[PDB]
Design a protein around this ligand. Structure first.
Ligand SMILES: [Zn+2]
Length: 468
């Protein structure tokens, strides 16, 4: 049984976890925003032939804006807007653009329902296709897998970027949840006067249900009565009443996430090292430019390397999700001598991320044994520390260099101790060789080993210099 677990006992972190048995395989976290793509029933306040556009009271203290290019044929009893829409005439409206400075919000009757994989436009069939970002090979199957969906005649569809690695049956499951929603949309509207909200475009539960409900999900356990009932409303309004029987209140004293043992794996998304089933590990270091992943073996050399890399490919994949790693990612797989092992390790990472929602690109193992890849984002320092002694002689040589300059040290405590005792001879030797030059070595308890300043040049006291 795969379950969605939702924890909201804590006001400042709403947590959503997809869990297969007890194995965490996805996580979404939302701490304490915009009003766009929201669907309402609005009343036509006033019309203007002057702007070929009308005004719609969808419920905001400001009235929205409905151009003639957005009035659907379904609403008509080139034209003037005076011929199409009457005042007080109800209409199903979606925000096309937010409120800007003054009370301006642009609307459309041409509604769109964006799911995980598909964007249904039940209102105009003149829309549809594969996302522009998809390309030659990645998109090819799609247009085919696209054609095989069962789309009602009067509407058109778009395949999203997340649709790159999904199957025909998985796309079908999306299109249905979209249609179910659209049926709830136009029904919560036929049953009421003007105007009032239907689809909250983006509250977190709407998203979790939008993005995460696959047929394989058995239960949705929510540990908050106040939230659970909002979710029922959210499931019903989200068109799919039936999952309503499968949302169940969590009542156990042991907090939801602790009872399913996931509180620790959630913490693993922070861990730098992650153990692979066969004993090996991946190390995930992040740098300025990119994220780098190294892979060590557990404890046939060719078989071990191969099996370890394959186990890594899987773990990397799920770690890419839990961590929500964005941008450039470089993987140092354990070296493999046969080309096909490389091909086989590659194809996996390909297969392992097929279910991730983000846009992912993966290149081949370079001759150095590196796999460059990238991942679309869905949503520091302390450096070895140089010896005191080694650091001291460094500074000492740096002071001397400053003492030589024509027209001519703030160090951590034990550096100053080392310099002004163990190296007093050399410090003296500088001042005597550089006649007239004062070498002020002030210890500073506000600093430490790593750090210092050698400043080149008042009747100020040595210990009052760090402040100056
Ligand atoms: Zn450090």
């Amino acid at each position: 049984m795969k379950r969605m677990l939702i924890n909201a006992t804590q006001q400042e972190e709403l947590r959503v976890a997809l869990v297969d048995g007890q194995r965490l395989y996805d996580l979404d976290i939302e701490s304490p925003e915009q009003k766009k793509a929201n669907i309402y029933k609005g009343k036509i306040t006033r019309i203007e032939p002057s702007l070929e556009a009308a005004f719609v009271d969808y419920g905001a203290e400001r009235h929205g804006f409905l151009p003639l290019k957005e009035i659907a044929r379904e609403y008509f009893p080139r034209p003037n807007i005076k011929d199409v829409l009457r005042e007080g005439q109800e209409v199903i409206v979606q925000i096309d653009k937010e409120e800007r400075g003054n009370k301006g919000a642009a609307l459309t009757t041409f509604i769109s329902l964006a799911g995980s994989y598909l964007v249904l436009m039940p209102n105009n069939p003149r829309a549809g296709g594969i996302s522009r970002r998809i390309e030659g090979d990645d998109r090819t199957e799609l247009k085919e897998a696209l054609a095989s969906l069962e789309l009602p005649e009067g509407m058109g569809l778009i395949v999203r970027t997340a649709g790159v690695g999904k199957s025909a049956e998985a796309l079908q499951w999306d299109l249905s949840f979209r249609l179910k929603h659209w049926e709830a949309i136009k029904k919560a509207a036929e049953s009421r006067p003007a105007p009032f909200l239907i689809h909250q475009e983006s509250n977190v539960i709407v998203r979790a249900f939008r993005d995460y409900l696959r047929q394989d999900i058995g239960e949705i356990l929510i540990d908050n009565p106040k939230v659970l009932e909002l979710a029922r409303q959210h499931i019903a309004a989200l068109g799919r009443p039936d999952f309503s029987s499968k949302i169940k209140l969590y009542t156990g004293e042991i907090p939801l996430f602790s009872h399913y043992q996931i509180e620790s794996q959630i913490e693993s998304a922070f861990q730098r090292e992650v153990r692979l089933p066969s004993g090996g590990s991946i190390v995930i270091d992040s740098t300025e430019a990119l994220t780098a992943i190294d892979i060590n073996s557990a404890r046939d050399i060719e078989e071990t390397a191969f099996n370890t890399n394959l186990e890594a490919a899987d773990e990397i994949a799920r770690q890419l999700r839990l961590r929500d790693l964005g941008g450039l990612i470089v993987i140092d797989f354990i070296d493999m001598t046969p080309v096909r092992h490389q091909r086989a390790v590659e194809n996996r990472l390909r297969e392992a991320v097929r279910q991730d929602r983000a846009r992912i690109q993966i290149s081949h193992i370079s001759r150095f044994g590196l796999l460059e890849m990238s991942r679309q984002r869905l949503s520091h320092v302390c450096c070895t520390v140089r010896d005191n002694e080694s650091l001291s002689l460094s500074i000492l040589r740096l002071i001397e260099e400053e003492a030589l300059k024509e027209n001519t040290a703030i160090v951590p405590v034990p550096i100053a101790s080392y310099l002004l005792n163990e190296k007093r001879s050399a410090v003296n030797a500088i001042e005597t060789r550089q006649d007239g030059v004062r070498c002020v070595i002030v210890p500073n308890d506000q600093m430490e080993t790593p750090h210092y300043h050698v400043l080149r040049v008042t009747p100020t006291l040595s210990y009052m210099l760090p402040k100056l």
